[PDB]
Design a binder for this molecule. Structure first.
Ligand code: HEM
Ligand code: HEM
Ligand code: HEM
Ligand code: HEM
Lengths: 113, 113, 113, 113
């Protein structure tokens, strides 16, 4: 198994959510970006990782994409402001990928900056 | 599984080389970037993916890094000019990670643009 | 002239905001999209066109971009949920351009769907 | 004059043809999409911008529309294959608008992808 270590030790933050938008994977790089320990994120709705002023609109965007059945995801290709646990904000770059695994719709977000 | 699909179907090209600098993984995103189908890459040396005019210097950079036993990789942090099989060139963004597994040092390059 | 007619009679909604984020142009295509007649938009702030739940976050995104002096705009590259005057919502496709003229920074949004 | 700069610096390729289907405006974005410098296009028939295997049928479609007097243009609303100067092809999205200016029938094509 080299794929897990590749994402686990990746320099970029990696966030993987399942079909119900729940976090199943959150690597150390991601821990440093957000300010949350992985244990505080696993199993929780992706909502807790979204900035407070985007939480109201975000769920509509995942919903729309899942209902789109399109293998292509072009979203979040720009600079986005990530809100940390302590409330401070930093600018980042996101690379979003829709992932069909175990016969379900997964999303992987690789983050940096 | 979940991790293999996360890199295989990733929007970013993914290239994994083992301890012998041989390409172990090369996703579809990477095939489009370089112009090589996976069959032409897997099992071959990393040098076939390095632009011709940088092939003379690149081996020393990976070697220097492997001998450094450091868990981090600061290199390739900026835009790199990628050269395709047909010779055309495109600018790209690289995210390089050193991956330790089963006692050996691997490298995973995530690419975009 | 030829350029004014090209945007005025364009099948795509066109919205131009000046350096003060005030709407300077709003074509008929845009009136149909939003549900606002031009008289209700021209001279007002861009926020009246931003869905209510995104109004809190949108100002920081334009500001961050203006402070970036970059000629490109990578944002809004994906489907956005537009909110009409009556409150109904429709999904749209945006094409955003930063326009430099007479020493000031303007933004032109071309919309469809 | 903000309308010219808005089309001139637009992210989308912009192609404006006059009553005799001759190109009068061709922006930098359009130069990158087609592979032709603007100087090579101005004054020439739109024909040079049409894929070789569509050149025979295209003229019949503009003809038909001009003879239609309808302010509505629904054509080319899908994905179209654009043929570049070097002959390679890419898929694109077109937004076509019929423009009545200076008392004549103009067409503006905004392109992306
Ligand atoms: C700092 C945190 C994050 C912010 C600020 C953020 C922001 C946004 C915004 C503004 C949109 C709609 C506009 C656009 O597409 O650009 C969006 C869409 C979306 N986001 Fe996020 N996001 C964040 C994290 C995530 C994570 C961790 C995932 C999942 C692993 C995710 C998955 C999605 C999906 C699936 C969409 C819809 C895709 C589309 O736009 O076509 N986001 N996000
Ligand atoms: C488009 C192809 C590529 C180009 C143009 C390229 C270019 C370079 C350059 C210029 C350096 C030294 C300067 C710097 O760090 O910025 C470098 C270092 C390095 N490259 Fe590449 N590279 C390419 C692909 C790869 C791939 C596919 C891997 C492995 C998965 C890789 C692994 C490394 C390593 C380990 C180093 C030394 C690490 C460090 O700088 O700290 N490179 N590369
Ligand atoms: C239906 C209404 C609109 C919605 C829902 C909307 C939504 C958004 C969102 C979610 C972002 C940040 C994430 C991203 O880039 O995808 C954004 C950024 C931005 N928007 Fe809007 N927007 C709307 C209308 C406009 C208009 C009319 C203009 C100006 C003519 C505008 C100018 C900008 C700029 C300059 C940015 C930052 C640029 C960048 O992301 O690089 N937006 N907008
Ligand atoms: C990559 C280049 C282009 C391709 C492949 C292309 C292809 C086509 C095709 C297949 C049709 C007929 C079927 C349909 O309406 O979908 C058409 C119609 C038309 N095209 Fe194009 N076109 C191109 C560029 C342009 C440009 C640059 C203009 C003008 C600024 C233009 C103006 C028109 C007009 C006026 C019609 C008739 C409208 C209608 O279908 O009702 N086309 N084109």
């Amino acid at each position: 198994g080299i794929f897990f270590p590749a994402l686990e030790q990746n320099m970029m933050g990696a966030v993987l959510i399942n079909e119900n938008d729940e976090v199943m994977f959150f690597n150390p790089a991601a821990e440093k970006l957000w300010g949350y320990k992985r244990e505080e994120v696993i199993g929780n709705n992706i909502d807790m990782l979204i900035p407070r002023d985007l939480r109201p609109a975000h769920p509509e965007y995942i919903r729309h994409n899942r209902e789109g059945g399109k293998a292509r995801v072009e979203g979040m290709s720009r600079e986005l402001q990530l809100e940390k646990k302590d409330g401070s904000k930093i600018w980042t770059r996101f690379a979003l990928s829709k992932v069909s695994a175990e016969g379900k719709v997964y999303y992987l977000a690789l983050v940096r900056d």
